[PDB]
């Protein structure tokens, strides 16, 4: 599933609801610490609508447990990420992924 560990607290009150647009900054790494993607390197927050399956399941479920302003580390099993096939050339088969995610605002 997805394990959410707080790095820095949010407001503890405003949680994302289905249909809302989450604006986040994130860094994705493989289990060994190798970074594969990051909005921070592009200096542009990423937006996605909760509930439209525009992102991996681990995000849909993990970000929903975060409050606005919170920074958290999400550890995601392959079944909630890219599964057995992964994404050849980027994400290996059966990969557990770790994400450093900061929820900036909801639109
Ligand atoms: N996949």
From Swiss-Prot:
Domain of life: Eukaryota
Keyword terms, alphabetized: Acetylation, Cytoplasm, Isomerase, Membrane, Rotamase, Sarcoplasmic reticulum
This protein's GO CC annotations: cytoplasm; cytoplasmic side of membrane; cytosol; membrane; ryanodine receptor complex; sarcoplasmic reticulum; sarcoplasmic reticulum membrane; terminal cisterna
Family, per entry: Belongs to the FKBP-type PPIase family. FKBP1 subfamily.
GO biological-process terms attached to the record: 'de novo' protein folding; amyloid fibril formation; heart morphogenesis; heart trabecula formation; negative regulation of activin receptor signaling pathway; negative regulation of transforming growth factor beta receptor signaling pathway; positive regulation of canonical NF-kappaB signal transduction; protein folding
Reaction(s) this enzyme catalyzes, per UniProt: [protein]-peptidylproline (omega=180) = [protein]-peptidylproline (omega=0)
Classification via Pfam families: FKBP_C
Cleaved signal peptide residues: none
Catalytic EC class: isomerase
Name of protein: Peptidyl-prolyl cis-trans isomerase FKBP1A
Subcellular location field: Cytoplasm, Cytosol; Sarcoplasmic reticulum membrane
Activity regulation (record text): Inhibited by both FK506 and rapamycin.
Functional description taken from the UniProt entry: Keeps in an inactive conformation TGFBR1, the TGF-beta type I serine/threonine kinase receptor, preventing TGF-beta receptor activation in absence of ligand. Recruits SMAD7 to ACVR1B which prevents the association of SMAD2 and SMAD3 with the activin receptor complex, thereby blocking the activin signal. May modulate the RYR1 calcium channel activity. PPIases accelerate the folding of proteins. It catalyzes the cis-trans isomerization of proline imidic peptide bonds in oligopeptides.
PTM sites of type N6-succinyllysine: 52
Positions where N6-acetyllysine occurs in the chain: 52
This enzyme's EC code(s): 5.2.1.8
């Amino acid at each position: 599933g997805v394990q959410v560990e707080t790095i820095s607290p949010g407001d503890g009150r405003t949680f994302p609801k289905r249909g809302q647009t989450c604006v986040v900054h994130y860094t994705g790494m493989l289990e060994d610490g190798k970074k594969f993607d990051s909005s921070r390197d592009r200096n542009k927050p990423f937006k996605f609508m909760l509930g439209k399956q525009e992102v991996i399941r681990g995000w849909e479920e993990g970000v929903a447990q975060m409050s606005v302003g919170q920074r958290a580390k999400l550890t995601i099993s392959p079944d909630y990420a890219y599964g057995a096939t992964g994404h050849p050339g980027i994400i290996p088969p059966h990969a557990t992924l770790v994400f450093d995610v900061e929820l900036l605002k909801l639109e």
